[PDB]
Amino acid sequence: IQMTQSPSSLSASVGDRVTITCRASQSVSSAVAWYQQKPGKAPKLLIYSSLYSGVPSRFSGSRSGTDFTLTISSLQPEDFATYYCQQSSSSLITFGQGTKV
Amino acid sequence: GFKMFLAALSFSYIAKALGGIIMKISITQIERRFDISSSLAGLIDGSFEIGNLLVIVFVSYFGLHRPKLIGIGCLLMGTGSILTSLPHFFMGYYRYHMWIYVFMGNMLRGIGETPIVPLGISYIDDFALYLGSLNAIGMIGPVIGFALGSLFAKMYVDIGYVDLSTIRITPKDSRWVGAWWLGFLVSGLFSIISSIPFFFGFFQSLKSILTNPLYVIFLLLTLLQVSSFIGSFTYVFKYMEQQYGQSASHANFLLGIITIPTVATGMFLGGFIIKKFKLSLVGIAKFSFLTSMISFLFQLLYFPLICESKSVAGLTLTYDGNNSVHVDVPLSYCNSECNCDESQWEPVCGNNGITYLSPCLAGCKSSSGHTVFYNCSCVESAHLGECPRDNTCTRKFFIYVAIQVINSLFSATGGTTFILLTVKIVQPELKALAMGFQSMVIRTLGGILAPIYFGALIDKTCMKWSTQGACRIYNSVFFGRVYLGLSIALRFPALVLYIVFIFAMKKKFQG
Amino acid sequence: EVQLVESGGGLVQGSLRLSCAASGFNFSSSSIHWVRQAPGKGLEWVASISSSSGSTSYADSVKGRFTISADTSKNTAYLQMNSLRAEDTAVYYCARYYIKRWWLMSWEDYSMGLDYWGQGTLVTV
Ligand SMILES: CC(C)CCC[C@@H](C)[C@H]1CC[C@H]2[C@@H]3CC=C4C[C@@H](O)CC[C@]4(C)[C@H]3CC[C@]12C
Ligand SMILES: CC(C)CCC[C@@H](C)[C@H]1CC[C@H]2[C@@H]3CC=C4C[C@@H](O)CC[C@]4(C)[C@H]3CC[C@]12C
Ligand SMILES: CC(C)CCC[C@@H](C)[C@H]1CC[C@H]2[C@@H]3CC=C4C[C@@H](O)CC[C@]4(C)[C@H]3CC[C@]12C
Ligand SMILES: *[C@@H]1O[C@H](CO)[C@@H](O)[C@H](O)[C@H]1NC(C)=O
């Protein structure tokens, strides 16, 4: 019902491991989604714990039951944008806060 | 006034249900009287839906004066119910293409029934729940129809024209015909009296209905289930009579006492389960799926309840009753000398428990008149009544009756959800067209076809024909296998489609 | 060839009717959701509707003044605002759930994240 991302701003270099974690406060369910939104563009679905077609094999999602985490093997210059975790239940759609750079 | 219209519409529902029941219970009598096959009887049964289809499209586009048009419809119902009774007066005495009048009477009855449902609710909601009460009062009609049919099937067809002290046959015989005409005439007069107190863009929506995969899957599923239901209820009386050795009147009465209270309680239980436990749409789908599964399992339970073919010398046995066998059966020495038309339907079984086709074909040489024969060479004393069914078939018949009660109850609970599980999946502004298209598809493709292709296979299972006229002996094993396998093959793909529907409906977004 | 075009973004003192024309998929087995993004802020869900039926879902901020509809024949979805006070000046996206196309059988799956979005119209208050 509600999800929040603590990291938000996250600076790193080209060779670095990026970790974005957000927790489902209420009505926990496995229907979690990961979107990458470039400045001034529409968001892009990446993890959703399965790789979307056409997404490079460096984004990964996992959960222990409440800790939904998105990981990037290497932070390329092409993915320096904002990220949102999304809970998509039935009759309810909620979004996180936003994790950039 | 609204109260007078309510009373008149209640009487119209009673008359409609009574006419439907009267037509349904008289089918086998029509087959016997007119010497027609079961496929032709199914065609006559589907002529009602043919007549309804010929006129539903018109009313669906015009509204004029609704009470007047409803009265005209009920008058046409009565006229069709009497037209079908007319061949009784227009024919000679029954001897133990006149069915065209029955066909046209059924068509006229359908044309007359068409206006009552839509125009009635239009007038009800225009000037002002009511529909449920109207159905409850119309449920009185089946009662009256079943009682009258049970009473009239035990009265001879030529009652009032014969002394009746000379009728050799009995209701348990395969040549008996009841007074079905009276039933039809009574329904016609009731409809006429009900009539008396009365005269006092699109194709784009059609595309959307089809473009909806859930609607199409549910339409195919409901079509299959309703076709199976129609093909089972059309020949349930005939199947019971030819499978368990029951008379037409007894079959009508017992099927009525099975159906009336069960339907009356199911119509309420199915609609109360949803409102009491607050079923969601997927919950309603699972409810209907479970009811369909239970009904399918009970249909499977009918298969062990198949009585074996009667021991008949000439069809299932050799003419002497020594070996088993049904066409071009050779003559035994004890029977060859006494040559016979080889076509004499004279059911006379021997104390050997073996039924024989005719006293000549049995080798009998003397007759008592209660008729007893003597010196029957190939019977090794006879009795004119053919040997009846065995205790084992009687216990199977009792189990069949119980399972029929349970199946009828489950059917009602499953049906009520269907309609509720076909509109909630369509836009509110488009529900009327969804209901209408579903009605056209189910009524046409079930009512017009299922009786015909059920009767065709039933005739395929026949073993002795009259004159071909009406079937005399049915292959009981083959009859049961076909009559139940067709329903099973119509219900199993419906089940596979239900799960597909549940699989697809769940993942959907619901507000 | 899935597309989602939004149009109807204009300055308002308030009411506004915005549209999300769709293409490339069977509209009947789909749903349309509106997402609000204030300038410099994050994504916010506004309203949702199912296309097979009249089923709709709404957000807490917008219940008494927001309406959403869908015309199956037109293959588009519509959104209405009323009494536009100075808090709905964001950009409005329209998105659909993922749809599976085994054979000709088309069915959506809400368990899958939005796989196709819209460009967006800027509503000015
Ligand atoms: C007993 C048998 C015949 C029952 C029906 C089974 C088969 C033929 C049915 C089951 C589900 C059906 C599909 C359900 C929905 C659609 C989408 C529609 O836009 C085109 C037809 C199409 C693709 C149907 C084709 C026929 C179909 C595949
Ligand atoms: C003996 C106990 C189980 C009671 C059984 C009652 C009888 C009447 C049965 C017949 C059909 C059944 C329903 C069939 C399907 C559903 C949907 C789902 O929500 C589970 C419960 C529910 C709603 C069932 C409740 C029990 C039920 C109503
Ligand atoms: C059998 C022959 C005539 C072909 C019939 C084709 C079908 C599609 C025709 C015959 C009867 C027609 C229906 C008659 C009644 C209604 C109810 C109305 O509120 C919406 C239109 C609707 C649903 C019509 C749709 C088209 C229709 C269903
Ligand atoms: C049976 O057959 C003859 C006639 O064929 C009859 O007269 C007689 O009484 C009976 N008994 C036997 C066995 O002849």
* Kind plus residue range of the DSSP H or E element containing B431: helix B431-442
Which two three-digit tokens encode residue B101?
A: 């009048």
Tell me if chain C has a CB within 8 Å of the CB of B220.
no
Which two three-digit tokens encode residue B122?
A: 């239009």
Chains contacting C with at least 3 CB pairs below 8 Å? A, B
CB atoms within 10 A of CB B67: 18
Contact B502, B289 (CB under 8 A): yes
CB atoms within 10 A of CB B325: 14
Q: How far apart are the first and last CA of chain A?
A: 26
Compute the distance between CA of residue B236 and CA of residue B45 in angstroms, rounded to an integer: 14
**Architecture of the A4-101 domain:** Sandwich (2.60)
Q: Which residues have C-beta within 8 Å of that of residue B326, sequence separation ≥ 6?
A: B315, B316, B463, B475
User: How far apart, in Å, are the Cα atoms of B460 and each of B453, B471, B478?
Assistant: 11, 10, 9
CB atoms within 10 A of CB B97: 7
| Beta bridge pairs of residue B348 | B356
Q: Give the torsion through C-alpha atoms of C50, C56, C60, C61, to 10 deg.
A: 80
Contact C57, C32 (CB under 8 A): no
* Kind plus residue range of the DSSP H or E element containing C32: strand C31-37
Q: Which residues have C-beta within 8 Å of that of residue B93, sequence separation ≥ 6?
A: B158, B161, B162
Chains contacting A with at least 3 CB pairs below 8 Å? B, C
Across the interface, do C113 and A88 touch by the CB < 8 Å criterion?
A: yes
Q: Which residues have C-beta within 8 Å of that of residue B438, sequence separation ≥ 6?
A: B219, B222, B419, B422
Q: Which residues have C-beta within 8 Å of that of residue C71, sequence separation ≥ 6?
A: C77, C78
Compute the distance between CA of residue B465 and CA of residue B475 in angstroms, rounded to an integer: 12
Give one DSSP letter per residue of A29-84, joined into a string: -S-EEEEEE-TTS--EE-----PPTTS-TTEEEEESSSEEEEEESS--GGG-SEEE
Helices (H), B278-390: 281-301, 333-336, 359-362
Residues of chain C with a following break (C to N over 2.5 Å) = 13
Contact B136, B142 (CB under 8 A): no
| Residue B242 one-letter amino acid | Q
From the number of C-beta atoms within 10 Å of its C-beta (0-12, 13-18, 19+), residue C94 rates as buried
User: B492 C-alpha to center of ligand 1: Å?
Assistant: 15
Q: Name the residue among B149, B352, B374 with its Cα closest to residue B247.
A: B149
Across the interface, do C113 and A93 touch by the CB < 8 Å criterion?
A: no
User: How far apart, in Å, are the Cα atoms of C19 and each of B453, C9, C75?
Assistant: 51, 9, 11
CB atoms within 10 A of CB B49: 23
Residue of chain C minimizing CA distance to A45: C115
Q: Which residues of B211-228 are buried (b: 16+ CB within 10 A; e: fewer)?
A: bbbbbebbbebbbbbbbb
Give the mutation target among B268, B273, B297, B421 for probing the ligand 2 site: most ligand atoms within 8 A of CB: B273
Pairing of strands A82-88, A32-37: antiparallel
Residues of C in contact with A35 (CB under 8 A): 43, 113-114
User: C101 C-alpha to center of ligand 1: Å?
Assistant: 13
Resolution of the PDB structure in angstroms = 3.0
- Judged by DSSP in three states, B55 sits in helix
Which two three-digit tokens encode residue B382?
A: 């006879």
Residues of chain B with a following break (C to N over 2.5 Å) = 63, 96, 128, 200, 325, 369, 380, 467
Dihedrals phi, psi of C7, to nearest 5 degrees: -145, 150
Compute the distance between CA of residue B245 and CA of residue B240 in angstroms, rounded to an integer: 7
| Beta bridge pairs of residue C16 | C81
The residue with tokens 């563009």 is A41
Residues of A in contact with B505 (CB under 8 A): none
Contact B91, B98 (CB under 8 A): yes
Q: How far apart are the first and last CA of chain B?
A: 42
Domain residue limits, chain C: 3-122
User: How far apart, in Å, are the Cα atoms of B403 and each of B265, B296, B348?
Assistant: 17, 12, 33
Q: In angstroms, what separates the C-alpha of B217 from chain C's closest C-alpha?
A: 10
Across the interface, do C33 and A43 touch by the CB < 8 Å criterion?
A: no
Tell me if chain C has a CB within 8 Å of the CB of A89.
yes
Catalogue all structural domains in chain B, each as residue range(s) with its CATH number: 1-200 (1.20.1250.20), 205-308+389-511 (1.20.1250.20), 311-388 (no CATH)
| Structural method | cryo-EM
CATH 3.40.30.10 is right for the domain spanning C3-122: no
| Residue B321 one-letter amino acid | G
Q: Which residues have C-beta within 8 Å of that of residue B371, sequence separation ≥ 6?
A: B383, B384
From the number of C-beta atoms within 10 Å of its C-beta (0-12, 13-18, 19+), residue A33 rates as buried
Planar angle of CA C2, C49, B502, nearest 5 degrees: 85
Compute the distance between CA of residue B387 and CA of residue B309 in angstroms, rounded to an integer: 12
Dihedrals phi, psi of C91, to nearest 5 degrees: -95, 140
Residues of A in contact with C120 (CB under 8 A): 42
The answer, yes or no, to whether any atom of ligand 2 lies below 6 A from the CB of B287, is yes
**Residues enclosing ligand 3, CB less than 6 A?**
B 53, 56-57, 60, 432-433, 436-437, 440, 444
User: B428 C-alpha to center of ligand 3: Å?
Assistant: 18
| Beta bridge pairs of residue A70 | A20, A61
Compute the distance between CA of residue B154 and CA of residue B176 in angstroms, rounded to an integer: 9
- Judged by DSSP in three states, C68 sits in strand
The answer, yes or no, to whether any atom of ligand 2 lies below 6 A from the CB of B276, is no
CB atoms within 10 A of CB B96: 14
Q: Name the residue among B455, B451, B445, B463 with its Cα closest to residue B482.
A: B455
